Ligand binder design. Sequence first.
Ligand code: MG
Ligand code: MG
Lengths: 452, 452
Amino acid sequence: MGSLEQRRLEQDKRPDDVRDEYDRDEARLIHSAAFRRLQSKTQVLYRTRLTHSMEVAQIGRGIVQYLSKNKKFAEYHEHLPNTSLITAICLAHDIGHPPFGHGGEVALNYCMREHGGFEGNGQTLRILGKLDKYTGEHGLNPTRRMLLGILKYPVAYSELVNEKAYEQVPDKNAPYWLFEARMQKPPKCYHDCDQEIVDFIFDGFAREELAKFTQTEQPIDKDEPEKPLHKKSLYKSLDCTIMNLADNISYSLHDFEDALSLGMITQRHWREHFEGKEALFNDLAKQLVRNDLNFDLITVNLFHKESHCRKEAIGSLVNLMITNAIIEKNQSGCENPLLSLEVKLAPQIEKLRQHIFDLVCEQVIFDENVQQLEFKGQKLVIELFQTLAKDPNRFLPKPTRERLKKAGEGLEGEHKKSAQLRVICDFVSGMTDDYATKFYEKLFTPSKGSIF
Amino acid sequence: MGSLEQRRLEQDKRPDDVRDEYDRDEARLIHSAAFRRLQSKTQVLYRTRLTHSMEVAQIGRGIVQYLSKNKKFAEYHEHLPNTSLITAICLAHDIGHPPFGHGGEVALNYCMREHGGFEGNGQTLRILGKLDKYTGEHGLNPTRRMLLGILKYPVAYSELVNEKAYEQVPDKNAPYWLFEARMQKPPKCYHDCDQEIVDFIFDGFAREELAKFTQTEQPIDKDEPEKPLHKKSLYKSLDCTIMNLADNISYSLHDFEDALSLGMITQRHWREHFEGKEALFNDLAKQLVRNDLNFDLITVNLFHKESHCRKEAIGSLVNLMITNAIIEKNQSGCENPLLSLEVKLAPQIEKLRQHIFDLVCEQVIFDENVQQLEFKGQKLVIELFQTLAKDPNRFLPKPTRERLKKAGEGLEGEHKKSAQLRVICDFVSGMTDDYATKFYEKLFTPSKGSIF
Ligand SMILES: [Mg+2]
Ligand SMILES: [Mg+2]
């Protein structure tokens, strides 16, 4: 089998470069157009995706550091990623996310219904492995282990999608962009047209390991037992578990901290969301003997006037989760360490992390005004994709027109159409929020737009 | 037959006026609302249609002057138009063009699919002969020869249209304004509802002359031999050939000069568009012995920092085409001089003029941002026409409501509908780009519009 430091394309380093291949991955990523676009992309609307990706990289390094010295896990030290690989994986995890976030993701998936759908994490793999113009046709040409580390869902769209969930009540009067977004969310997956990339990631493993590692589950009873739902992938690589843990800690605490600052989560919300289960903080305070973890003391410090009393509690909770990162084996039958080993929190810490994250989804993610803005990004992307798809040679830039022509060669009929719509999907998804707004305004908004 | 200085309506001049009828045409045109609208109408988006029409008038006068003294063409001096007639024809040629240019023209033709279509040059005749409020129902009431001079395409829409080219792949999800504009372009023609105007222009000629002069051709193989295409008219009057030559010289050189200034055409584009065929400049430089026509010398002067080195080359190329205007006979079997005689460039000069014009279409006319703005004018005009057509008495001004009522009298059924939609088409097409934008914003844009 192939090495983990192997790339799809041959790009050997000069003898002047003792940097390991994982550092070369970090260097290419930071100097890449896909990573620099994280500035003009916000996840909530304040906090940009670049800042979130840096905080996630910091948390992941702290996780890897904590594990690399805890001798209870000394048996697994050799399989931990290094500082450069965990950073590059953490800094790349939100690269594929489209403009306007979930509003744009639902939009592109709805437009690509007959052509493979769209999902952000799949586009992250698509950009990293092919789209980014660091190479001709191999993206940034990352190492096998880095590609595996960003593959959060190693199962294809077709193998996971349940198109019965897309079913809608007919409405002759509704425009094409007007629908319930929750019923058009894609499965978390990789795109079928990128199977070659996934083949490379998995050529360094035994095929029985691949079958066990790509196992899925059928979730049941989201509201009713017969409600149709997509299938979920079940397992991620070891490095991916570390990044996914850091990614959730930031969403649970750092987006919570921003919610306190903006006033979207009050102490009344806190004490009502924790009206029961004050032991989520208190019982932990007893076991670890940390008076700072007392529910009433940490509540006063979180909702304190002095900003140094809040950041001290946020950082205390950030440190509490990093110090409670355990590494177990997943219920996959895999014997490879990178496929069988998982990093996660202590069960009592995860209960507290989730319960803080649930208050964030309730007051921030599902705020009426936040959702109204997501729908507008849905309308904008749909209306932009339609127009770019109706006459792509009139509107698209010349290099994008070349890819669309190139994608259709050797293909005819419906396969040619899906391959060319994929290029348009990669063009729109690779837009920044302001670039997509300007592109919308040049095409539709009455008095806006300039030829330069 | 009738005189060339004859008008549809009787408007004789006072004895105090020794001005010839062609000067009276020039005077009425300049003081007309249709000609003054050329200020608020741009052709590219910089250079307005008024400025283009003045440069065309200057080139045409230079053409007529050059021919009126070249004794190789002395046999045809008596049939050349005078200074006033060639100016009025040149200043009127773009009067009918709608807001947003081709974007608005494709829009109106698409809306008028079942009602006669729309084309700019046809509206120029419609405004000049009927619409302009200089008279009651005869427009500016121009002379027969001036009307003939603006009749670039003396064949009707119905006689030229190939509705198979309008055929579209069905799309249930597309809004009414979303289509490929290239497949909805109208034929270059005059509108069927203006046949009476064309009858007057042609009552001063023998009917055999009319049949030969209105001959058409069926172009073949735009991309494939079986691609459906409209039919083209074949012949223009002598005065029209002079105006059409001046009109093309301005587009080929003056719009090229603006392209240099804005940076849309680089010296790299020039030397790559002329990578072969440097003899288009050089061979002419040999025959005429003009070292300024050397490809490398004129390239340095065109792309020079000093603006006096560029304008000296542009004006040299403007002068080179005027000095190479020849007058031949067209392959029409006509014996009337105004219908059989044509003015055009020398074959080697036309090869150079076209090749410069092709670089203008490639970098300017078909720039992605220029086309994106054209589509937005297409969407705006379509959405404006629809709403004005749904309830014309609620929205249209009282004088326009009078014409629409008046156009429907004596008619019922589908003929009444087409006659009233023609008035709405004349209202929208006669809008300036900013007037159409304000009219769009009052009706659709959320927070815009005032009752005054
Ligand atoms: Mg993230
Ligand atoms: Mg013109």
